[PDB]
Design an enzyme around this catalytic site. Structure first.
Site, PDB file in Angstrom:
ATOM      1  N   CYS A  77       0.690  -1.122  -0.171  1.00 12.92           N
ATOM      2  CA  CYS A  77       0.059  -0.111   0.183  1.00 12.92           C
ATOM      3  C   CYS A  77       0.632   1.184  -0.192  1.00 12.92           C
ATOM      4  O   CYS A  77       1.558   1.539   0.932  1.00 12.92           O
ATOM      5  CB  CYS A  77      -0.685  -0.088   1.069  1.00 12.92           C
ATOM      6  SG  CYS A  77      -2.053   1.557   1.076  1.00 12.92           S
ATOM      7  N   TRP A 104      -9.170   5.764  -1.462  1.00 10.37           N
ATOM      8  CA  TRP A 104      -9.641   6.180  -2.389  1.00 10.37           C
ATOM      9  C   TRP A 104      -8.479   6.035  -3.500  1.00 10.37           C
ATOM     10  O   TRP A 104      -7.246   6.009  -3.214  1.00 10.37           O
ATOM     11  CB  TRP A 104      -9.534   7.990  -2.117  1.00 10.37           C
ATOM     12  CG  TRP A 104      -8.373   8.496  -1.525  1.00 10.37           C
ATOM     13  CD1 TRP A 104      -7.299   8.873  -2.259  1.00 10.37           C
ATOM     14  CD2 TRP A 104      -8.439   8.947  -0.074  1.00 10.37           C
ATOM     15  NE1 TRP A 104      -6.267   9.372  -1.183  1.00 10.37           N
ATOM     16  CE2 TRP A 104      -7.036   9.779  -0.112  1.00 10.37           C
ATOM     17  CE3 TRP A 104      -9.157   9.179   0.827  1.00 10.37           C
ATOM     18  CZ2 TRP A 104      -6.480  10.301   1.054  1.00 10.37           C
ATOM     19  CZ3 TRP A 104      -8.570   9.587   1.943  1.00 10.37           C
ATOM     20  CH2 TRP A 104      -7.342  10.147   2.165  1.00 10.37           C
ATOM     21  N   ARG A 155      -0.231   4.480   2.886  1.00  9.14           N
ATOM     22  CA  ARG A 155      -0.292   4.242   4.190  1.00  9.14           C
ATOM     23  C   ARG A 155       0.102   5.375   5.134  1.00  9.14           C
ATOM     24  O   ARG A 155       0.111   5.577   6.203  1.00  9.14           O
ATOM     25  CB  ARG A 155       0.758   3.305   4.588  1.00  9.14           C
ATOM     26  CG  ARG A 155       0.422   1.873   4.273  1.00  9.14           C
ATOM     27  CD  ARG A 155       1.512   0.714   4.579  1.00  9.14           C
ATOM     28  NE  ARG A 155       2.621   0.737   3.698  1.00  9.14           N
ATOM     29  CZ  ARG A 155       3.562  -0.097   3.974  1.00  9.14           C
ATOM     30  NH1 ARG A 155       3.803  -0.882   4.737  1.00  9.14           N
ATOM     31  NH2 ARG A 155       4.664   0.123   2.835  1.00  9.14           N
ATOM     32  N   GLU A 204      -4.011   3.734 -11.070  1.00 10.92           N
ATOM     33  CA  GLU A 204      -4.684   2.554 -10.855  1.00 10.92           C
ATOM     34  C   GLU A 204      -5.587   2.403 -11.835  1.00 10.92           C
ATOM     35  O   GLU A 204      -6.006   1.381 -12.466  1.00 10.92           O
ATOM     36  CB  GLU A 204      -5.426   2.319  -9.671  1.00 10.92           C
ATOM     37  CG  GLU A 204      -4.437   2.094  -8.431  1.00 10.92           C
ATOM     38  CD  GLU A 204      -5.075   1.839  -7.019  1.00 10.92           C
ATOM     39  OE1 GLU A 204      -5.304   2.975  -6.431  1.00 10.92           O
ATOM     40  OE2 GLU A 204      -5.584   0.802  -6.905  1.00 10.92           O
TER      41      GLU A 204
END
Ligand code: HEM
Ligand code: HEM
Ligand SMILES: C[C@H](O)[C@H](O)[C@H]1CNc2nc(N)[nH]c(=O)c2N1
Ligand SMILES: C[C@H](O)[C@H](O)[C@H]1CNc2nc(N)[nH]c(=O)c2N1
Ligand SMILES: N=C(NCCC[C@H](N)C(=O)O)N[N+](=O)[O-]
Ligand SMILES: N=C(NCCC[C@H](N)C(=O)O)N[N+](=O)[O-]
Ligand SMILES: [Zn+2]
Lengths: 414, 416
Positions: free
Chosen positions: A118, A290, A121, A295
Site C-alpha cells: 500500500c 481512495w 499508508r 490504478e
C-alpha cells in the site's frame, strides 16, 4: 542482520530493525529471490481443518494484546494483565477468543500500516472501523456493505473505512464476499472468445449469472454482490445505482476523449482479502480509501488484458501506431492518466496522482523510520506503473517482510 | 506440483517453472525473514580484495564446475578431453595455485557471464559478442591501446557491435589490472563553489581523481573524461581519448525546434569498465564490455534523474507546462518528449539504439528461449522494467526469479 537501506537520490541511509519483529516467512531464500511474484501458497491462509494449537493462537494473541497496550501506554498496568488472563481463559476453554471493539480498531489500523503493497499508508491513522461481527445473514452483510459504501463515498469527499464481519470459526463455513472489490464492472465473454467490459471480471460475472443475475450488455455494468453466509450458497444483491458513484471520463484539451464514453467508479474497495489480528482471522473485511490515478488510467484502462484502450486512443490522437519508437503508447498513456485526474477533480471526487502519492509515502517512511525503526515495503508495487524513476520511491531501497496484524490473500470460496 | 519456483505471466496467464536456480551455488541477500531484492548493492557478489589465491580447495570446485560447463556447452561432457582438461586444471592449482583458460574457454565464459547477468535486458544478443583476448597486456599504456581498438571496433561508425576486452586475471602477490573509470566514456562532473555541479553529478569523484592525477580539467557540462588505467602494483597513469574515436550524438526533437537549442548531447557507446568478470573462479578485475543503449537509459535516467542532469524542469518550461502542480503530469509529459528526442537523434545519426518497448519485447523472447535451453533465466525485475511506461511493457507482467549464476559480472570495490 539489520539491513542497510539507502536512497540513491539523497545518499541518505538507514538501518531497518523493524523486520526483527517479523514472525512469518516470505517467499525468498538465500539462493533465489521471488519478491516479484504476486501470490504465495506459503503466505496464504489455509482454512480451518480443526482448531490451531492452543499454544500458537495463544501466542499470537498474547503478542497482539501486548501491542494494544503499549499502544495506549498502559503496558504492564492492571487492565493489561486482566485482559491477558481473559484471553488465556477464553482460549483454554473454547480454543479461541474474541476481541474488544477498541482492539479491533487498533488491529485494523495496524494491518493497514503493515500492508507492504500500500502506497497510501500515510493515512493509516485515520480509519473509520465499522464493527459488523454482529452479523448473522447475507441479507445483513448487504446492508452493512451499503452503509460502508454510502459513508466511504460521502458524495465524492471520500473517507477511508473498513467493515469487519464475523471472524472465522473452526468447523464452520466462512462469511465471504465473493466479489474481489465491492464495486467492479462485469466482463461478458462474447462468442469470439473476446470480452465486453472488464476481462478481469469474467469469472465473477459468470458465477453471478449462474446464481440468477440477469446480466447487461455494456462495457461498464456494475456487478451485483454475491454475499455468502456460513455453509450457505451465496445470495445475490444488486447495488442501488444512487449509491454507486461513478466518474465519466473526459479530457481537458481533447474534446473527443469524452466521446469514448469511458467511465469509472469512485470507490476502490478490495473485498476478498483476509484480515488477521492476534491469530484471529476475519475472512470478510472489505476496506476502502481512495484511488491513485494510475490504478485507473494506467493499469485498468491500458493493461492489454484489461480494457486495453491504449490503441483506440492513440488512433484518435493521430499517432504513429506503426512503430514502437514513436512512443505512441507512452504518449497516449499520459493523456489517459491526465483524463482520469481531470475528470475526478471536475466531479469533485477524491483522487491522488502518483507524484503526490509517492511523495506522501516518502514522508510516511520517514515518520515510520522514527516510530518503529523501519517500514515493510514492496518496491515493485510501490513504484507507479508509469514514470517510475520520475517519482521519489523509485530511488528508494526498501525491505519487505511480514508483520501482524496483516491483510493476507485467501483462496476463492468456489 | 514441482519443487521449483512457479512463475506466472499475468498478461497471458501462462506458467513456467524455474529449475535453473537449483544450479546457483552462491546465496544472495534475501532470507525467509525479509526480502532485500530492491537493494542496488547488497554485500553478496562483492569481492573484497582477497590478499591471496582462493582456498586451494574452494578454487578447485569452482574451476571444476566451469570446465564441466564448457564441455557440456560443446556437447562433450564426460569425454576423454573433458576429463583430461579436469586433471590438467587440478594439477596446475596443486603446483601454481591458480590456472589459466584456453582461448575458447574464455570466449565461452565471457558469453555465459553476460547470459547470466540478472540486470541486463538485452540478453537476447548474448550469443553474439566479440571477445578480444588481451590477457597478454603488460602496461597501462598497452591497456590504452586495447581500449582504443575496442571503441574503434565497437562503435563501428554508428552500427554498434557488442564486445568485451579481457585483461590479465588477478595474480597472487601481484597487483590487479584496474580501470578506475566507471565507464570507458563518461562526462565530467565539476564541483562548483556555490555547491552545485556542472556536468554529470555522478562522475564527480572520478573527475576529482583525474585532476589529482594531472588531468587538465575543462568546464563544460559534457566533457569526456580521461582514462585512469592501472597496471599491477603501479599507480594509475592518465590517457586522453582521441576525440575522433568517441562518437557523440547531438540531441534534437522531431517536432519541437527549440529542444535542439538546449545543446544536449550524449555519447553512443556505453561501456561499464569497473565490473569484475569471474569465470571458473578466476577473477578478471578489468574486462570492459559494451553493446548499445536502450532509449530510456539516456532519456530517463541520465537526463531526468534528480541527481544527474535533472533537465525535467527546463524542458517542461519550454513546453509551457504547469510545473507548480503535480496533477498536470508535467513531469510525465516532458519525460516522454525527452525520450522521444534521444530516440529520434540516434536514428537520425545512424547510431544503434533500442527503445524500451522493442527492448523488453525482445527480452520476453529471450526468456522463452532460455526456458527451453536452461529451464529458466535469472532476472532482476526492478532493473528489467523500464524507468518509464513500466506496465506498458510486457516485462512488468512477467514474474521473475533472481539468483546468482557463474560465470558472472560482479561489482568490485573502487581501486582507491
Ligand atoms: C487513503 C487512500 C489509499 C490509497 C491512495 C491507497 C493506495 C493503494 C494502492 C495504489 C495500492 C496498489 C493497488 C493495486 O495496484 O492493485 C494499494 C494496496 C493496498 N492497500 Fe492501500 N490505499 C489507500 C487506503 C487503504 C486502506 C483504507 C486500506 C485498508 C485499511 C488499504 C489497504 C491496502 C492493502 C492491503 C493493499 C494491497 C492489496 C492487494 O494486494 O491487492 N489501503 N493501496
Ligand atoms: C547489445 C545490447 C545491450 C543492451 C540494449 C543492454 C541493455 C542493458 C540495460 C538497459 C542495462 C541496465 C542499465 C542501467 O540501468 O544502468 C544493462 C545492464 C547490464 N548489462 Fe546489458 N545490454 C546489452 C549489452 C550488454 C553486453 C554486451 C554485456 C556484457 C557482455 C552486458 C552486461 C550487462 C551487465 C553486467 C549489466 C548489469 C550492470 C549493472 O549492474 O550496473 N550488456 N544492459
Ligand atoms: C509480475 C509483477 O509482480 C506484477 O505485475 C506486479 C508489479 N507491480 C505492481 N504494482 C502494483 N501497485 N500493483 C500490481 O498489481 C502490480 N503487479
Ligand atoms: C533503489 C532502487 O533499487 C534503484 O533505484 C534501482 C531500481 N531499478 C533500476 N533499474 C535499472 N535498469 N537501473 C537502475 O539503476 C535501477 N535502480
Ligand atoms: N486504492 C486502493 N486500491 C485497491 C485496489 C484497487 C485496484 N487497483 C483497482 O480497482 O484499480 N485501495 N484503497 O484505497 O482502499
Ligand atoms: N546498454 C548498456 N548500459 C550499461 C549501463 C549504461 C548506463 N545506464 C548509462 O550510461 O546510461 N550496456 N551495454 O549495452 O553494454
Ligand atoms: Zn527477495
Amino acid at each position: 542482520k539489520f539491513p542497510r537501506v539507502k536512497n540513491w537520490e539523497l545518499g541518505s541511509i538507514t538501518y531497518d530493525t523493524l523486520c526483527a519483529q517479523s514472525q512469518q516467512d516470505g517467499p525468498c531464500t538465500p539462493r533465489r529471490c521471488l519478491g516479484s511474484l504476486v501470490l504465495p501458497r506459503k503466505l496464504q491462509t489455509r482454512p480451518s481443518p480443526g482448531p490451531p494449537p492452543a499454544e500458537q493462537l495463544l501466542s499470537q494473541a498474547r503478542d497482539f494484546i501486548n501491542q494494544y497496550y503499549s499502544s495506549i501506554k498502559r503496558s504492564g498496568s492492571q487492565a493489561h494483565e486482566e485482559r491477558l488472563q481473559e484471553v488465556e481463559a477464553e482460549v483454554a476453554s473454547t480454543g479461541t477468543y474474541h476481541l474488544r471493539e477498541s482492539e479491533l480498531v487498533f488491529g485494523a489500523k495496524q494491518a493497514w500500516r503493515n500492508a507492504p503493497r500500500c502506497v497510501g499508508r500515510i493515512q493509516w491513522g485515520k480509519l473509520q472501523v465499522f464493527d459488523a461481527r454482529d452479523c448473522s445473514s447475507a441479507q445483513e452483510m448487504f446492508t452493512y456493505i451499503c452503509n460502508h459504501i454510502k459513508y466511504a463515498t460521502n458524495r465524492g469527499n471520500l473517507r477511508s473505512a473498513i467493515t469487519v464481519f464475523p471472524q472465522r470459526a473452526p468447523g464452520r463455513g466462512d462469511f465471504r464476499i465473493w466479489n474481489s472489490q465491492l464495486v467492479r464492472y462485469a466482463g461478458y465473454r462474447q462468442q469470439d472468445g473476446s470480452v465486453r467490459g472488464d476481462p478481469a471480471n469474467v469469472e465473477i460475472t459468470e458465477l453471478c449469472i449462474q446464481h440468477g443475475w440477469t446480466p447487461g450488455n455494456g462495457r461498464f455494468d456494475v456487478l451485483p454482490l454475491l454475499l455468502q453466509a456460513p455453509d450457505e450458497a451465496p445470495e445475490l444483491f444488486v447495488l442501488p445505482p444512487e449509491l454507486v458513484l461513478e466518474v465519466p471520463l473526459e479530457h481537458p484539451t481533447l474534446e473527443w476523449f469524452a466521446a469514448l464514453g469511458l467511465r469509472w467508479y469512485a470507490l476502490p474497495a478490495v473485498s476478498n482479502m483476509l484480515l488477521e489480528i492476534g491469530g484471529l482471522e476475519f475472512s470478510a473485511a472489505p476496506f476502502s480509501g481512495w484511488y491513485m490515478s494510475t490504478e485507473i488510467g494506467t493499469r485498468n484502462l491500458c493493461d492489454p488484458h484489461r480494457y486495453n484502450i491504449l490503441e483506440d486512443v492513440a488512433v484518435c490522437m493521430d499517432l504513429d501506431t506503426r512503430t514502437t519508437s514513436s512512443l505512441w503508447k507512452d504518449k497516449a498513456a499520459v493523456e489517459i492518466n491526465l483524463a482520469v485526474l481531470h475528470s475526478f477533480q471536475l466531479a469533485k471526487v477524491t483522487i491522488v496522482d502518483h507524484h503526490a502519492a509517492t511523495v506522501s509515502f516518502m514522508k510516511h517512511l520517514d515518520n515510520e523510520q522514527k516510530a518503529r525503526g523501519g517500514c515493510p515495503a514492496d518496491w515493485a508495487w510501490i513504484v507507479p506503473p508509469i514514470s517510475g524513476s520520475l517519482t521519489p520511491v523509485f530511488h528508494q531501497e526498501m525491505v519487505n517482510y511480514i508483520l501482524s496484524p496483516a491483510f493476507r490473500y485467501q483462496p476463492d470460496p468456489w
